[PDB]
Amino acid sequence: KVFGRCELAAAMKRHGLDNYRGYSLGNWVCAAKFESNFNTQATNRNTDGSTDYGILQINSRWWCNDGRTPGSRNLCNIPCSALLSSDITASVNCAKKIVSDGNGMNAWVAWRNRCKGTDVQAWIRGCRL
Ligand SMILES: [Cl-]
Ligand SMILES: [Cl-]
Ligand SMILES: [Cl-]
Ligand code: NA
């Protein structure tokens, strides 16, 4: 599924992401834009051989199981394929663990390089929320 901006903002908000660990909704939307272009089926292979899955490009090195990332963990207790669903529940629940791990949203390198410190409220401007 490819979400619309305000559609994704609504789905995130309903699942409790807005101001989760202090991060306003626009941070999460910004992060989703640059990680996946709002496409739930997005995948990206990393140099280390792990893969990133879903709207928030959650990595198999630590967070989901894909059966092909040697020495990895599955701390969200999910198959990485659940991160590709048109329903974002699994992505959001696993993002909550990730952003709680100590480094906040810096876990997402594209958040750090493309959203952090920017006018992230623009990402939810005009949305009926
Ligand atoms: Cl915001
Ligand atoms: Cl594995
Ligand atoms: Cl933080
Ligand atoms: Na894994």
UniProtKB/Swiss-Prot annotation:
Localization recorded for this chain is: Secreted
Tell me the InterPro entries matching this sequence.
Glyco_hydro_22, Glyco_hydro_22_CS, Glyco_hydro_22_lys, Lysozyme-like_dom_sf
Give the E.C. number(s). 3.2.1.17
Q: Name one Pfam family in it.
A: Lys
- Give me the Gene Ontology terms describing cellular component: cytoplasm; endoplasmic reticulum; extracellular space
Q: Any keyword Disulfide bond?
A: yes
Swiss-Prot/TrEMBL GO biological process terms: cell wall macromolecule catabolic process; defense response to bacterium; defense response to Gram-negative bacterium; defense response to Gram-positive bacterium; killing of cells of another organism
Tissue distribution of the protein: In the egg white and polymorphonuclear leukocytes.
Alphabetized, the UniProt keywords read: Allergen, Antimicrobial, Bacteriolytic enzyme, Disulfide bond, Glycosidase, Hydrolase, Secreted, Signal
GO MF terms here are:
beta-N-acetylglucosaminidase activity; identical protein binding; lysozyme activity
Q: Report disulfide bridges, numbered on this chain.
A: 6-127, 30-115, 64-80, 76-94
- What PROSITE patterns does this protein's entry cite? GLYCOSYL_HYDROL_F22_1 (PS00128), GLYCOSYL_HYDROL_F22_2 (PS51348)
Coarsely, its chief localization is: secreted
**Positions of the C-type lysozyme domain:** 1-129
Chemical reaction(s) catalysed: Hydrolysis of (1->4)-beta-linkages between N-acetylmuramic acid and N-acetyl-D-glucosamine residues in a peptidoglycan and between N-acetyl-D-glucosamine residues in chitodextrins
**Is this entry keyworded Lipid biosynthesis?**
no
Instruction: Please tell me where substrate binds in this chain.
Output: 101
Give the enzyme's main class according to its UniProt record, as a single word.
hydrolase
| Active site annotation, chain numbering | 35, 52
Family membership = Belongs to the glycosyl hydrolase 22 family.
Further comment found in the protein's record: Lysozyme C is capable of both hydrolysis and transglycosylation; it also shows a slight esterase activity. It acts rapidly on both peptide-substituted and unsubstituted peptidoglycan, and slowly on chitin oligosaccharides.
User: What does this protein's UniProt record list under function?
Assistant: Lysozymes have primarily a bacteriolytic function; those in tissues and body fluids are associated with the monocyte-macrophage system and enhance the activity of immunoagents. Has bacteriolytic activity against M.luteus.
Q: How does this protein assemble?
A: Monomer.
Q: What is this protein called?
A: Lysozyme C
